[PDB]
Design an enzyme around this catalytic site. Structure first.
Site, mmCIF file in Angstrom:
data_model
loop_
_atom_site.group_PDB
_atom_site.id
_atom_site.type_symbol
_atom_site.label_atom_id
_atom_site.label_comp_id
_atom_site.label_asym_id
_atom_site.label_seq_id
_atom_site.Cartn_x
_atom_site.Cartn_y
_atom_site.Cartn_z
ATOM 1 C CD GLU A 124 -2.918 -1.163 0.253
ATOM 2 O OE1 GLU A 124 -3.321 -0.066 -0.187
ATOM 3 O OE2 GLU A 124 -3.358 -2.265 -0.125
ATOM 4 C CG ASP A 125 0.354 4.420 -2.114
ATOM 5 O OD1 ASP A 125 0.558 4.018 -3.279
ATOM 6 O OD2 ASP A 125 -0.672 5.048 -1.780
ATOM 7 C CB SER A 126 4.972 0.349 1.342
ATOM 8 O OG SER A 126 4.624 -0.927 0.841
#
Ligand SMILES: [Mg+2]
Ligand SMILES: [Zn+2]
Ligand SMILES: [Zn+2]
Lengths: 496, 115, 67, 82, 186, 186, 99, 49, 50, 258, 148
Positions: free
Chosen positions: F173-175
């Site tokens: 998740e957006d990592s």
RNA sequence: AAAACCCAGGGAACCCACU
């Protein structure tokens, strides 16, 4: 004493909108200085790890520790009361990988199955017989997922790309596209698992697993799915790139032909309005009628170009893989990336004439054309012209303004709602009373049924014909042969 | 701050067993081999060799967490054949193979250096 | 600032190439020719010199505070 | 009200079970006698859950009717939710 | 030193914290010895529409193989995706920058072809060691006997009104009392 | 307090920026032919918002001064370059037109938060909250505007080999998943 | 918006003709019809974007606004006018004036 | 006081840091750092067990 | 669960179905009591479900 | 079951890299050999830096980091040195450490480059690798100086990347994917590998179901700390030692169980 | 001995309405003599099938010729003589639907058995006299072998 | 002088970030 593994904590994110914004978790100690939490917990929290920081509360007393463990554990609020559906769901990366995993043409050698089975916590240690014995022992991905599915649950779902005419003709039980999800006796028979099967939608596989089985079993179900599909994803691999964004030259020619046809169509509409040859639609002015025609032509062009672009994905494009699984993106996202961004809108209409009868100083005065009024014919791959780029900024700024202002106005709303009903409860006589014992409802929800254990159902008594209702429900006992086929002969003569 | 040192990826501590054998109870002739302070760099090869035995019914390995240096190898062999002896035969086979590869690489180096 | 010692991806020794890279650049070589004249086949090693800014000389203009 | 006029739901609902578990684990942790034969546990909450499955918690729950009246249900008398 | 939780961002709004750090041997690798430095989520692209990120990656591959600093002016019309692909094809790479990545654990080459190439990532000020803080009965305010504010003064978190409302909805009255009276200001 | 920008001056259907102006402007520091000399030459002039409402301004000379199906054929001014409509933080975005406008806004916001060598004499400044980087690099994929922001002299960020791949499950998740060896190499 | 006058017109269905204003219905069709009308209207805005919310929560909000005979607007002007307690009314936006 | 101190107030025994995704633990498990765990205490009752 | 194989004729008396449903409807109680006011409430509470 | 017999065929051997082929072995064995190349090969690297004095524009930890990453010639000493944590010495000795000393002051108007040559060791064998120019550590303005004593100790890649002897380890099997482990959507666009043997008309080799990964190609490029062949030899020796230790622990566990 | 069905089929059409999957395709086949239709999903990669091929198909309850009725666990070390050696392609899967042209008054004449082999479906539309051995939710094999 | 620093007694305003 310092907290150890297995301790209970309260784990919440501002703003706490609903009751799943604040959950109880079990403490696990890991070296680095962050809160490692699981993936499916993201959806109830709406925390996308983009610098999000979390709050963790510890119940100090022992009595309140049991209070959280019996109320605020995440398995106990998988299904929401607001819309009687699960809220955990499957995150994008597991969802896309499991959609590819459960395809019909997925085959696994003994080693890869032998690796994947190690990550099942609920595995009894019996390797299932391969779907392919000869020439080579070869398991189908659906067999592995059948081990994941716990107990014996039965559900029927439809894949995201399931054709609507497929159930009409033949093959309605043997799907050529494998687009019919059928889980039977706790075993995945056939079908491809999209977001409509494992997502948060009502009646999904996880929702039925929560109800038919317990809540701890579903907790293992979520963990098993995430572990094994990600491990298979190492062998499979999923990516995205520019080759996933380029269509063949034939499609590009089709896109350009459609835009040129639509652009010329708007121009000939404009010349009809100038010569007063355009007639006003009954109900609005000649300006609004002219604006309607221009909007209809451009919207049709955007739809036709988007439809024509989304017909050339070659089934290997990762954009289609993500959209079809429903994990992230939509058909609009593919269309704007590949074919055309489309018309930009401000306050629901085209770009206003900020200058004297022109949107920019670069267009001639009184120019109602597509490009002059904010229509963008290019795509994100081809890039936007400076006049289009500014017009694209017009739409984006409206979006952020909406996002920034919505928070304050909405935020005031729930506070009024909660403070107005912060004392409405269900008493022990199954009635609903406020703080001053005034009955609001004689039974909660007019029926006394909680909002978690209900499902959408179809009333068969409603919408037959009168003859159809009688044919399907009367149980005609006068017929001999029908009774012979349905009941045993001792019962048949008993009724007769 | 909370960054662990560099040496726990391979160094054991007092009271830490390098290998722990736990006999599985779900199916007969199955054991869990817990290797501490190790990673795929041994488990993958052990799994691959144990697949070459025609009397091994199950042999796989996994890491519970990449931040914790431990692996578990689950070995299920046919009845009348212990999983432990399968493991110790796989280790000896790997030692023999790596040794053989070693002198063959020595011979290749010698052949290359003087033509 | 100063040139990194090793390729971030590879670990290839690149810290000794910067002076020769500048010498080749002033030798009327294209930087692409300079890179593979220095022996950098992998582009991850090539970016270490192609995209490096030598700010240490700007830092050396100031007189040292402690003497 | 006598057992003839005992109108509340016979099922132990989740709030009652959650509070009973907490208030029983608190007692067990404070050296209260254990009602059931434990097979060896250190966490008192697990002991309280074991007693719950054994239906031997020495607690009578007072359910307050909204009119002012109250009923007294025994834990063993209540049907456990799970 | 960059550790997990440190916030990184590209030049396209593709921000993100460091999920985890693997060693070189665990990181995947191409046919050559090139292993990726940053591995980002493919799912951040389709919804955000950062096609400029992909084009920057492709242009970075072309620039690094060609040996020149590429140009990325917005409105150029002289550098499109097709020309970049054609230039990349001359250097023995795929037309669209995809490359066969080998797994770092099993060694089996990944079935998919991973899009790889050099981009320009920038490290943000929002690091995790500046933000991490815990508290247990720390310093107490003097106006009212409540905890301080801010981690600089060893302050505690505030159990605000919506948190109280959520704990009412949970029906955890004892936990709410604990938080608001026992754990805050008995 | 009025806001204006310099623009090219267009005669009948021709620019006043002739080749001799470019020849004299290339040899700066020799002919002492500066921007003010071009302004006094009657080639460019500053146009404010008021005068923009009464000017027909073309994108570029290569398109809007060649005879075609005539659009206006009455241009008064010509834009010097479309890329100059962007600000200082939006000019560091490679291919900003290919992105989505919210992403460009987010990048412009984060571009001010990216750590790096903020000033050359930082060792003398007793600044509070000073963030500098070990090995800042100029971007491989750059715009022509960076030569004037002097971003190639005080960069903020490192060119990195990124791979856009679903993987073990930490770039979720957006990592981002980083390389331990690379970080250990600075 | 004008009921009780449009419904009087000929050839107009006096049964199915609904309205959008809530105050106007309360003057015309009473309090219980508003509880139904507010339910339908609130369901309309919630489910317009395809979202779903259980009917239990819709019923409670519509009933608590009509459990007093008149329209209980959710403000300080409607919540703080019912006998709930000085602390309840001061817990809302207006604090000192209530106490 | 009513809202800023009585309704919503600062509480001890609480931690706040950035979250990072992790798929190798169950949905009911959270991975807290050691330093937070080495600063956050639970009151356990002394029993002979 | 019970391995019906619905091709074969079934073996449950339809009068058991009618009697079982009627007994089941009595067992599903939202409102207790026996007075007709509670009986109507119980009937209305489970009217749709029955 | 038993272990198959692998074979080695060296295509080239250069002072920088070594290129060879390993046949008749499992994929996991080859991947493990690559991983041991990357990590488990022990070399000598600077790990303990004492800054006696510093006046350069670069701060002290920056200089220590740059010194740690400098490769060192450890072709034969690393096999003799004990691990620093494993030595019974007084926390340092020549048997588990190598002393380095740097003492440079810029006493001239020219920018003096403190290179890797300025590192002076007490052991003549353990020296910085740098035909090629020396490793620039730090530049010095007039009046600036830095004095430091650095101890280098044995370590491997898992500990830190400064103990990584391999610049780049190229690994590929089945260059024409006859196993079809990867699936090209359009194989025509994909350039052939270096070891491909198909005519330009053909894109990829036909699929065979009965095949298995074999004939693994290596290209191990050394960073200069070790010869490319002694890297492979030490890697195989270390992997065999790890297996032997694991077997010893397994035997202890088994005899404890019995 | 444990065989539920046996007939020789002939491949008429291969996935005629398009090629949905690269590794598996469905075969529209007619029986040689019994005049029944069979649609089978087959792995093309490990067992390529061309149009117009002729193959024997023997649905059996168990591989073991003694009809020992194995549970269905993977036992690669069982050396007892199985019937799989006579064939060259074994697909193991579960029958999940047996529909047929039936009436509430009379019996069914044309039956249609639906079996899924993990993810590979097969519909066998034949006569009730030939499909009588099939039982809903029962455990079966495939055992096909092509022949000239 | 238990110098158990069992480890703040400052507040206010403003700005800047992150969700
Ligand atoms: Mg966020
Ligand atoms: Zn490199
Ligand atoms: Zn020593």
């Amino acid at each position: 004493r310092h907290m150890c593994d297995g301790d209970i904590v309260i784990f919440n994110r501002q703003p706490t909108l609903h009751k799943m914004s604040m959950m109880g978790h079990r403490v696990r100690i890991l070296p680095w200085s962050t809160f490692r939490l699981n993936l499916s917990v993201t959806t109830p929290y709406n925390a996308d790890f983009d610098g999000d920081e979390m709050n963790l509360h510890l119940p100090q007393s022992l009595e309140t520790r049991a209070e959280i463990q019996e109320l605020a554990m995440v398995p106990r609020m998988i299904v929401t009361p607001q819309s009687n559906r699960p809220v955990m769901g499957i995150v994008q990366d597991t969802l896309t990988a499991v959609r590819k995993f459960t395809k019909r043409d997925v085959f696994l050698e003994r080693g890869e199955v032998m690796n994947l089975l190690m990550f099942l916590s609920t595995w009894d240690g019996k390797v299932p017989q391969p779907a392919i014995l000869k020439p080579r022992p070869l398991w189908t991905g659906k067999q592995i997922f059948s081990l994941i599915i716990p107990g014996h649950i039965n559900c029927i779902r439809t894949h995201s790309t399931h054709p609507d005419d497929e159930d009409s003709g033949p093959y309605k039980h043997i799907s050529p596209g494998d687009t019919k999800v059928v889980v039977e006796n706790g075993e995945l028979i056939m079908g491809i698992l999209c977001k409509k099967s494992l997502g948060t939608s009502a009646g999904s596989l996880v929702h039925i697993s929560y109800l038919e089985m317990g809540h701890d079993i579903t907790r293992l179900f979520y963990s098993n799915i995430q572990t094994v599909i990600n491990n298979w994803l190492l062998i499979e691999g999923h990516t995205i790139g520019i080759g996933d964004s380029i269509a063949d030259s034939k499609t590009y020619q089709d896109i350009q032909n459609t835009i040129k046809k639509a652009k010329q169509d708007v121009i000939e509409v404009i010349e009809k309005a100038h010569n007063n040859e355009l007639e006003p639609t009954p109900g609005n002015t000649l300006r609004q009628t002219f604006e309607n025609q221009v909007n209809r032509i451009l919207n049709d062009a955007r739809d036709k170009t988007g439809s024509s672009a989304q017909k050339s994905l070659s089934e290997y494009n990762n954009f289609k893989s993500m959209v079809v699984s429903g994990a992230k993106g939509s058909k609009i996202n593919i269309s704007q990336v590949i074919a055309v961004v489309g018309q930009q809108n401000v306050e629901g209409k085209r770009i206003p004439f900020g200058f004297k009868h022109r949107t920019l100083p670069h267009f001639i005065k009184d120019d109602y054309g597509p490009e002059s009024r904010g229509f963008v014919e290019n795509s994100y791959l081809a890039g936007l012209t400076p006049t289009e780029f500014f017009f694209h900024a017009m739409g984006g700024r409206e979006g952020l303004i909406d996002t920034a202002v919505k928070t304050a106005e909405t935020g005031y709303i729930q506070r009024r709602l909660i403070k107005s009903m912060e004392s409405v409860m269900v008493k022990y006589d199954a009635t609903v009373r406020n703080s001053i014992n005034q009955v609001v409802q004689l039974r909660y929800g007019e029926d006394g049924l909680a909002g978690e254990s209900v499902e959408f159902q179809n009333l068969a008594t409603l919408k037959p014909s009168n003859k159809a209702f009688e044919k399907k429900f009367r149980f005609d006992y006068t017929n001999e042969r029908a009774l012979r086929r349905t009941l045993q002969e001792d019962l048949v003569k008993d009724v007769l | 701050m909370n960054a662990p040192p560099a040496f726990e990826s391979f160094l054991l501590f007092e009271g830490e067993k390098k290998i722990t054998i736990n006999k599985d109870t779900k199916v007969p002739n199955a054991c869990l081999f817990t290797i501490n302070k190790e990673d795929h760099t041994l488990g993958n090869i052990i799994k691959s060799q144990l697949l070459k035995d025609p009397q091994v019914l199950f042999a796989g390995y996994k890491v519970p967490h990449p931040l914790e240096h431990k692996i578990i190898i689950r070995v299920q062999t046919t009845p009348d054949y212990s999983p432990q002896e399968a493991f110790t035969n796989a280790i000896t086979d790997l030692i023999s193979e790596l040794s053989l590869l070693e002198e063959r690489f020595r011979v290749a180096i010698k052949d290359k250096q003087e033509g | 600032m100063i040139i990194p010692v090793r390729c971030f991806t590879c670990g290839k020794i690149v810290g000794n190439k910067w002076e020769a890279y500048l010498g080749l650049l002033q030798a009327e070589y294209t930087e692409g020719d300079a890179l593979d004249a220095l022996g950098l086949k992998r582009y991850c090693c090539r970016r270490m010199l192609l995209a490096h800014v030598d700010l240490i000389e700007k830092l050396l203009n100031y007189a040292p505070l402690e003497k | 009200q006598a057992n003839q006029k005992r109108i509340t739901t016979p099922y132990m609902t989740k709030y009652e079970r959650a509070r009973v578990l907490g208030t029983r684990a608190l007692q067990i942790a404070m050296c209260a006698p254990v009602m059931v034969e434990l097979e060896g546990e250190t966490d008192p909450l697990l002991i309280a859950m074991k007693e719950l499955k054994a239906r031997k918690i020495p607690i009578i729950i007072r359910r307050y009717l909204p009119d002012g009246s109250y009923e007294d249900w025994g834990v063993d008398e209540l049907i456990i939710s799970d | 030193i960059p550790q997990i939780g440190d916030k990184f961002a590209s030049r396209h709004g593709q921000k993100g914290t460091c999920g985890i750090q693997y060693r070189q041997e665990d990181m995947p690798f191409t046919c050559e010895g090139i292993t990726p430095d940053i591995i980002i989520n493919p799912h951040a692209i389709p919804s955000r529409m950062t096609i400029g990120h992909l084009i920057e990656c492709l242009q970075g591959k072309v620039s690094a193989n060609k040996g020149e600093i590429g140009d990325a002016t917005p409105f150029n019309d002289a550098v499109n995706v097709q020309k970049i692909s054609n230039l990349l094809s001359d250097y023995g790479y795929h037309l669209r920058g995809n490359e066969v990545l080998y797994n770092g654990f099993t060694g089996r080459k990944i079935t998919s072809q991973i899009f790889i190439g050099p981009t320009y990532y920038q490290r943000l000020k929002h690091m995790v060691d500046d933000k991490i803080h815990s508290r247990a009965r720390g310093p107490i305010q003097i106006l009212n006997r409540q905890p301080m504010e801010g981690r600089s003064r060893d302050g505690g978190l505030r159990f605000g009104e919506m948190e109280r409302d959520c704990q009412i909805a949970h029906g955890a009255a004892q936990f709410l009392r604990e938080r608001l009276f026992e754990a805050s200001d008995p | 307090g009025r806001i204006c920008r310099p623009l090219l001056i267009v005669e009948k259907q021709k620019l006043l920026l002739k080749k001799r102006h470019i020849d004299q402007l290339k040899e700066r520091e020799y002919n002492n032919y500066s921007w003010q000399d071009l302004v006094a030459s009657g080639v460019v002039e500053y146009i404010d918002t008021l005068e923009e409402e009464t000017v027909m301004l073309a994108m570029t000379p290569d398109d809007l001064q060649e005879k075609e199906v005539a659009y206006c054929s009455t241009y008064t001014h010509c834009e010097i370059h479309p890329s100059m409509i962007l600000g200082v933080c939006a000019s560091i975005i490679p291919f900003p037109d290919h992105n989505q406008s919210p992403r460009n806004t987010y990048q412009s916001a984060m571009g001010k938060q990216a750590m790096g060598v903020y000033i050359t004499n930082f060792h003398v400044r007793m600044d509070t909250l000073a963030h500098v980087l070990y090995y800042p690099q100029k971007p491989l994929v750059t715009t022509r505007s960076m030569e004037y922001l002097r971003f190639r002299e005080l960069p903020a960020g490192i060119n990195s080999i990124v791979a856009i791949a679903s993987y073990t499950g930490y770039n979720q998740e957006d990592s981002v998943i980083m390389n331990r060896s690379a970080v250990d190499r600075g | 918006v004008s009921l009780m006058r449009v419904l009087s017109e000929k050839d107009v269905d006096p049964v199915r003709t609904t309205s959008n204003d809530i105050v106007e219905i309360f003057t015309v069709l009473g309090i219980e019809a508003v509880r139904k009308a507010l339910e339908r209207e609130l369901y309309h805005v919630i489910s317009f974007d395809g979202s779903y919310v259980n009917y239990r929560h819709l019923a409670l909000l519509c009933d608590t606004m009509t459990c007093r005979g008149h329209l209980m607007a959710i403000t300080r002007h409607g919540v703080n006018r019912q006998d709930t307690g000085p602390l309840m009314k001061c817990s809302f936006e207006e604090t000192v004036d209530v106490l | 006081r009513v809202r800023g101190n009585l309704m919503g107030k600062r509480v001890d025994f609480s931690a706040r840091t950035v979250i990072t995704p992790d798929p190798n633990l169950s949905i009911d498990q959270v991975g807290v750092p050691r330093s937070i765990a080495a600063n956050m205490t639970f009151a356990e009752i002394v029993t002979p067990f | 669960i019970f391995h019906i194989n619905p091709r074969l004729p079934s073996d449950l008396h339809p009068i058991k179905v009618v009697e079982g449903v009627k007994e089941l409807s009595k067992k599903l109680v939202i409102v207790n009591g026996d007075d007709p006011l509670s009986r109507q409430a119980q009937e209305n509470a489970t009217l749709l479900f029955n | 079951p038993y272990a198959n017999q692998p074979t080695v065929r060296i295509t080239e051997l250069t002072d920088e890299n070594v290129k060879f082929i390993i046949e008749n072995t499992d994929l996991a064995v080859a991947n493990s050999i690559r991983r041991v190349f990357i990590a488990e090969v022990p070399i000598i690297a600077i790990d303990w830096v004492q800054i006696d004095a510093n006046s350069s524009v670069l701060h002290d930890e920056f200089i220590a980091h740059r010194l740690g990453l400098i490769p060192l010639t450890s072709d034969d000493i690393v096999d003799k040195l004990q691990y620093s944590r494993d030595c019974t010495c007084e926390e340092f000795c020549p048997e588990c450490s190598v002393e380095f000393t740097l003492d440079v002051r810029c006493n001239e108007d020219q920018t003096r480059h403190v290179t890797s040559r300025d590192l002076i060791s007490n052991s003549p064998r353990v020296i910085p690798v740098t035909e090629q120019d020396d490793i620039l550590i730090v530049k010095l303005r007039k009046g600036q100086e830095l004095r430091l004593r650095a101890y280098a100790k044995k370590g491997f890649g898992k500990e830190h990347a400064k103990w990584n002897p391999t610049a780049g380890v190229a690994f590929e099997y089945d260059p024409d994917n006859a196993l079809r482990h990867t699936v090209y959507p359009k194989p025509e666009e994909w350039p052939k590998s270096e070891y491909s043997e198909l005519d330009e008309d053909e894109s990829q080799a036909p699929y065979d179901p009965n095949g298995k990964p074999e004939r693994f190609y290596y290209n191990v490029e050394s960073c200069g700390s070790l010869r490319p062949e002694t890297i492979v030899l030490s890697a195989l020796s270390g992997l065999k030692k790890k297996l032997s230790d694991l077997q010893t622990q397994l035997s202890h566990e088994i005899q404890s169980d019995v | 001995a444990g065989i539920l069905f046996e007939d020789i089929f002939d491949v008429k059409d291969i996935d005629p309405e398009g090629k949905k999957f690269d590794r598996v395709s469905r075969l529209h086949c007619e029986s040689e003599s019994f005049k029944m239709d069979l649609i089978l999903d087959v792995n093309i990669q490990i067992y390529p099938v061309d149009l117009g091929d002729k193959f024997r198909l023997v649905i059996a309850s168990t591989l073991y010729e003694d009809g020992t009725l194995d549970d269905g666990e993977y036992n690669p070390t069982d050396d007892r003589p199985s019937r799989a050696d006579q064939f060259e392609y074994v697909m193991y899967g579960k029958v999940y639907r047996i529909e047929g042209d039936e009436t509430s008054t009379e019996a069914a004449t044309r039956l249609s058995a639906y079996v899924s082999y993990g993810g590979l479906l097969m519909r066998l539309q034949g006569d009730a006299n030939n499909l009588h051995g099939f039982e809903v939710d029962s455990r079966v094999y495939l055992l096909m072998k092509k022949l000239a």
